[PDB]
């Protein structure tokens, strides 16, 4: 039901990285402010910020013209990477309560806001109306607790998790500066949600698991197919050190295993030192490559390797708080396999607030 | 290629925040001349100049992770960037303990489960180089001395 | 000696109460006043610091020796873990 952007479902590297080193796994979802080497901001000195208000309303008027030219229904707009800029559209902010959640969305992925509203016993006026999301009447509480009669609770709902969100107004002093290579741009923000403890709907694999190795192999295969699609020479041909630049932790035996079927190495003559595509091999279409790896599997893999790094840096309680254990515990509790001790050490708050997702019989 | 945009939050003093807010909601390019940002080669120090009045700035790390989410219909929201830094205007000093929202205050101290600085790895890399550049190394776990 | 409804209902009520508390805590627009008391660990279980003696040759001819003491239990663990691994790499 969730439709991510075309950069997200095609697993583009800027948004979905092929390899994350140790210093990039410690700064997972906390990207530092990088210094530019070339560009207008790379030259040291004062730099004017630029107010985008004409850009926002011009883009919104243009998208409304596109929607009314296409019959007036609901449209799909996020088709390019330049659609995912912060320079246009209605931005909200979303703050997280936990430090490191078990699952977290990459850039370019979609989520929905669902307003769960339990009616009052007998007569009820109607859901308190809310600016964002669609309202749904929930007799059966989605979360661990149950809604009170007449209580509306907003929540982020996607394929990765489901988490209760709470709308707060922004501080009166904070603005949002979008810096690019060319200059600074400023928006105001008015809406900021606080996201509670996530209820995971996707199971993060463990390290060295079968699902883990399957995702690594399928991700490498999808990258190899998309490099073959990008090739301009007729017998489509790629170079090995492009793949070695993308996946540098991989042993080259695994990369040659992926290239063994679907390619062959030409040493001499034309196409020398290239891996040309086999003439009998039909390169898979775009929808087959999309059906190979899902973006949520990439987010689960990134959560696993980030937690692997954090545990590795910190020398059994911590192992229980690892997202493969907690996601397995919560999904098993949702099928009714087992129960969870709601007070424990997997508690991301460290106090009595919040749950702990570890299995109890 | 495409480079992920880098968004951060700018916090201003309240009177200067009111002037910057009025100039942003006005929408002219007059604001462009009025508001400038100079980031020093420390990386954690700056000047924000509001109406050509210099203010001293520090780029700090935020305890939670925020994410900007854009929308066209206010029902489906697409994540655009991750925010983790704030250029407050007026190391341990460059770490902010509180969160932006009102319920998140003293989050790092109270609502965060004990977590490690991963710092220590860099210190170990410094000691290893000195060991490998030596000749004889003598070690003993010690007591009070 | 309930092994069924008692455990299930107890888990359910702790879930509902905890959820309610969380909801009350996050949607609060109450201002919170600006370290939280925590158990202070000793310099390791053994209460032992690490001291290293280093022998080097200076320019021209010299043989100075540097004794350096590491009082941080974190630097200790990472240092000696590598040393123990090396003792086993050969």
DSSP string, B81-144: EEEEEEEEE---TTB--S-SSSS-SSIIIIIS-------HHHHHHHHHHHHHT-S-EEEEE---
Under DSSP, the state recorded for A214 is H
Give the whole-angstrom CA distance, residue C52 versus residue B139: 5
Beta bridge partners of A134: A114
Residue A90 CB neighbours (<10 A) = 17
Give the whole-angstrom CA distance, residue A47 versus residue A70: 41
Residues across chain B: 145
Partner-chain contact A166 C26, CB within 8 Å: yes
Beta bridge partners of B79: B69
Question: How close C78 gets to chain A, by Cα (Å)?
Answer: 8
Backbone angles phi, psi at B126, to 5 degrees: -60, -40
Chain B interface test: which of A28, A39, A49 (most B C-beta within 10 Å):
A49
Q: Which of A125, A109, A142 is nearest to A6 (CA)?
A: A109
Q: How many helices (H) and strands (E) does chain C have?
A: 2, 2
| List of long-range contacts for A261-266, beta carbons under 8 Å, 24+ apart | A262/A224, A262/A225, A262/A228, A263/A224, A263/A228, A263/A238, A266/A237
Burial class for A153, CB neighbours closer than 10 Å (0-12, 13-18, 19+): buried
CA distance readout (Å), A153 to A55, A247, A248, B99, C27: 34, 43, 45, 22, 11
Q: Which chains touch C (3 or more CB pairs under 8 A)?
A: A, B
Give the whole-angstrom CA distance, residue A118 versus residue A153: 9
A vs C: CB pairs below 8 A: 51
Contact A19, A249 (CB under 8 A): yes
Give the whole-angstrom CA distance, residue C10 versus residue B139: 55
End-to-end Cα distance, chain C: 59
Give the whole-angstrom CA distance, residue B44 versus residue B64: 19
Max CA separation in chain C (angstroms): 84
- Pairing between strand B35-39 and B46-50? antiparallel
Under DSSP, the state recorded for A103 is -
| Backbone Cα Rg of chain A | 24
Give the whole-angstrom CA distance, residue A7 versus residue B26: 34
Backbone angles phi, psi at C31, to 5 degrees: -70, 140
Contacts of A29 (CB under 8 A, 6+ apart): A104, B65, B82, B84
Question: How close A21 gets to chain B, by Cα (Å)?
Answer: 13
Q: Which of B130, B24, B43 is nearest to A170 (CA)?
A: B24
Give the whole-angstrom CA distance, residue A160 versus residue A144: 17
Q: Which residue has the tokens 């000691």?
A: B127
Which of A97, A144, A153 minimises the CB distance to C15?
A: A144
DSSP class per residue in C70-84 = E--HHHHHHHHHHHH
Task: Establish if C77 touches chain A: CB-CB under 8 angstroms.
Answer: yes
Neighbour-count burial for A345-360, b at 16+ CB within 10 Å, e otherwise: ebbbbbeebbbbbbbe
Contact B59, A75 (CB under 8 A): no
Chain B residues inside the 8 Å CB shell of A3: 76
Q: Which chains touch B (3 or more CB pairs under 8 A)?
A: A, C
| Backbone Cα Rg of chain B | 22
Give the whole-angstrom CA distance, residue B70 versus residue B80: 7
Tokens of A83: 């659609």
Q: Which chains touch A (3 or more CB pairs under 8 A)?
A: B, C
Tokens of B15: 């009177």
Give the whole-angstrom CA distance, residue A165 versus residue A21: 32
Give the whole-angstrom CA distance, residue A276 versus residue C89: 42
* Helix, strand, coil percent values for chain C (each to nearest 5): 45, 15, 40
CA distance readout (Å), B27 to A58, A90, A185, A187, A189: 13, 16, 12, 11, 15
Question: How close C90 gets to chain A, by Cα (Å)?
Answer: 23
Task: Establish if A93 touches chain C: CB-CB under 8 angstroms.
Answer: no
The answer for A138, left when phi > 0, alpha when psi is -120 to 50, beta otherwise, is beta
Strand (E) positions, C6-90? Answer: 50-55, 65-70
Give the whole-angstrom CA distance, residue A197 versus residue A353: 10
Contact C46, B141 (CB under 8 A): yes
Q: Which of A31, A3, A58, A247 is nearest to B3 (CA)?
A: A31
Chain B interface test: which of C23, C58, C75 (most B C-beta within 10 Å):
C75
CA distance readout (Å), A78 to B1, B79, B80: 18, 11, 11
Beta bridge partners of A266: A274
Give the whole-angstrom CA distance, residue A187 versus residue A90: 10
Contact A156, A94 (CB under 8 A): yes
Contact A107, A207 (CB under 8 A): no
CA distance readout (Å), C10 to A15, A339, A352, C4: 44, 11, 16, 10
Tokens of B89: 């205007």
Sign, CA dihedral A333-A338-A341-A347, equals: negative
Name the 3-class secondary structure at A178: strand
Neighbour-count burial for B11-24, b at 16+ CB within 10 Å, e otherwise: bbbeebbebbeebb
The helix (run of H) or strand (run of E) holding residue A67 is helix A54-69
Max CA separation in chain A (angstroms): 83
Tokens of C70: 């590491």
Q: After which residues is chain A broken (C to N over 2.5 A)?
A: 315
Window 1-20 of C: residues touching B by CB (8 A cutoff) are none
Partner-chain contact C22 A196, CB within 8 Å: yes
Partner-chain contact C54 B103, CB within 8 Å: no
Sign, CA dihedral A347-A349-A352-A354, equals: negative
DSSP class per residue in B13-66 = -HHHHHHHHHHHHH--THHHHHEEEEE-TTSS-EEEEETTEEEEEEEEEEEEEE
B vs C: CB pairs below 8 A: 77
Backbone angles phi, psi at A131, to 5 degrees: -65, -35
Give the whole-angstrom CA distance, residue B46 versus residue B49: 10
Q: Which of A89, A194, A9, A155 is nearest to B70 (CA)?
A: A89
The runs of H, that is alpha helices, within A230-265 are 240-246, 252-260
Chain B interface test: which of A43, A53, A166, A175 (most B C-beta within 10 Å):
A175
Chain A residues inside the 8 Å CB shell of C15: 144-145, 342, 355
CA distance readout (Å), A157 to A110, A131, A199, A248, A259: 9, 16, 10, 35, 38
Question: How close A40 gets to chain C, by Cα (Å)?
Answer: 39
Window 188-207 of A: residues touching C by CB (8 A cutoff) are 194, 196-197
Contact B48, A47 (CB under 8 A): no
């Amino acid at each position: 039901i969730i439709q991510h952007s075309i950069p997200a479902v095609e697993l583009r590297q800027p948004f979905f990285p092929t390899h994350m080193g140790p210093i990039k796994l410690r700064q997972f979802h906390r990207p530092p402010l990088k210094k530019y080497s070339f560009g207008a901001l790379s030259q040291p000195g004062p730099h004017s910020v630029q107010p985008l208000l004409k850009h926002i309303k011009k883009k919104a008027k243009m998208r409304e013209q596109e929607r009314q030219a296409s019959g007036g229904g609901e449209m799909f707009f996020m088709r390019t990477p330049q659609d995912l800029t912060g320079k246009d559209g209605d931005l909200i902010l979303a703050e997280y309560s936990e430090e490191n959640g078990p699952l977290m969305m990459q850039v370019g992925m979609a989520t929905k806001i669902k307003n769960y509203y339990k009616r009052k016993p007998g007569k009820d006026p109607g859901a308190p109306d809310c600016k964002y999301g669609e309202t749904v009447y929930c007799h059966t509480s989605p979360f661990l607790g149950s809604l009170h009669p007449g209580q509306l609770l907003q929540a982020f709902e996607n394929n990765l998790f489901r988490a209760p969100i709470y709308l707060h107004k922004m501080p009166e002093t904070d603005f949002l500066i979008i810096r690019t290579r060319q200059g600074y741009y400023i928006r105001e923000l008015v809406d900021i949600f606080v996201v509670g403890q996530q209820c995971p709907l996707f199971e993060v694999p463990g390290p060295n698991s079968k699902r883990a190795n399957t995702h690594i192999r399928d991700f490498l295969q999808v990258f190899i197919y998309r490099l073959f699609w990008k090739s301009k020479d007729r017998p489509r041909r790629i170079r090995m050190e492009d793949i070695k630049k993308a996946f540098p932790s991989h042993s080259e035996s695994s990369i040659r295993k992926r290239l063994k079927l679907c390619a062959d190495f030409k040493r001499t003559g034309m196409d020398s030192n290239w891996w040309v595509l086999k003439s009998d091999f039909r390169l898979p279409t775009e929808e087959e490559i999309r059906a190979m790896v899902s973006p949520e599997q990439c987010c689960a893999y990134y959560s696993m390797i980030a937690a692997e790094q954090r545990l590795k840096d910190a020398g059994d309680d911590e192992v229980r708080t690892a997202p493969w254990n907690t996601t397995r515990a919560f999904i098993a509790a949702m099928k009714g396999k087992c129960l969870l001790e709601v007070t424990g050490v997997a508690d991301p708050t460290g106090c009595g607030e919040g749950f702990s997702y570890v299995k109890i019989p | 290629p495409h480079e992920l945009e880098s968004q951060f939050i700018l916090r201003l003093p309240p009177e200067y925040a009111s002037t910057v807010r009025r100039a942003v909601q006005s929408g002219h390019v007059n604001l462009k001349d009025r508001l400038t940002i100079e980031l020093h080669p420390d990386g954690r120090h700056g000047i924000v100049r509001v109406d050509r009045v210099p203010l001293a700035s520090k780029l700090v790390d935020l305890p939670c992770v925020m994410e900007s989410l854009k929308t066209i219909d206010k029902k489906t929201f697409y994540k655009t960037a991750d925010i983790c830094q704030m250029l407050v205007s007026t190391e341990k000093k460059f770490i902010w303990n509180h969160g932006i929202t009102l319920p998140l205050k003293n989050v790092r101290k109270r609502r965060f489960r004990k977590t490690a600085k991963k710092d220590v790895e860099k210190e170990v890399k410094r000691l290893l180089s000195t060991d490998a550049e030596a000749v004889s190394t003598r070690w003993e776990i010690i007591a009070e001395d | 000696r309930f092994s069924v409804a008692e455990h299930q209902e107890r888990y359910k009520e702790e879930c509902q109460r905890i959820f309610d508390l969380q909801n009350k805590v996050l949607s609060s627009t109450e201002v919170l006043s600006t370290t939280a008391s925590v158990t202070s660990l000793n310099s390791s279980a053994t209460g032992r610091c690490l001291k290293i003696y280093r022998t080097f040759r200076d320019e021209e001819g010299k043989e100075y020796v540097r004794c350096e003491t590491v009082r941080k239990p974190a630097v200790i663990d990472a240092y000696v873990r590598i040393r123990t691994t090396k003792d086993e790499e050969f």
